[PDB]
Design a protein around this ligand. Sequence first.
Ligand SMILES: CNc1cc2onc(C)c2cc1NS(=O)(=O)c1cc(Br)ccc1OC
Ligand code: NA
Length: 126
Amino acid sequence: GSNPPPPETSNPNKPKRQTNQLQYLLRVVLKTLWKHQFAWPFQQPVDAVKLNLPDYYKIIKTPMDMGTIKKRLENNYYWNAQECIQDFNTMFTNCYIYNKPGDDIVLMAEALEKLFLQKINELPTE
Ligand SMILES: CNc1cc2onc(C)c2cc1NS(=O)(=O)c1cc(Br)ccc1OC
Ligand code: NA
């Protein structure tokens, strides 16, 4: 097992901008998920070598983590909040795909996902 390159956090070929919604996603949504007790497995790309997970990138082809999401928001990688929201969902979904119902990591992802959904219920309109 080697690790694949991490997801891009910059791209000259990809339209990007700042929005009010994206700023909230960084300052309020991301920051509250990042500081939760259960953030730690999701703060960086999965290191399948150091975690001894040789099948991780056999199963998961569109990997995502909050480290990547944070650097994207900070770099203004996104065109809109929906793209950023989709990266969160990919993150959660990957966890639920690779693992099983009730697994410790799954229960952590579910808890972060609940909090995420709450927080983005307060997302401004443009
Ligand atoms: C079962 N190991 C893991 C599965 C994972 O799915 N998505 C991620 C991210 C992820 C990370 C691990 N490895 S781990 O962080 O050391 C880990 C976390 C938790 Br909660 C419980 C068990 C773990 O490793 C046995
Ligand atoms: Na699964």
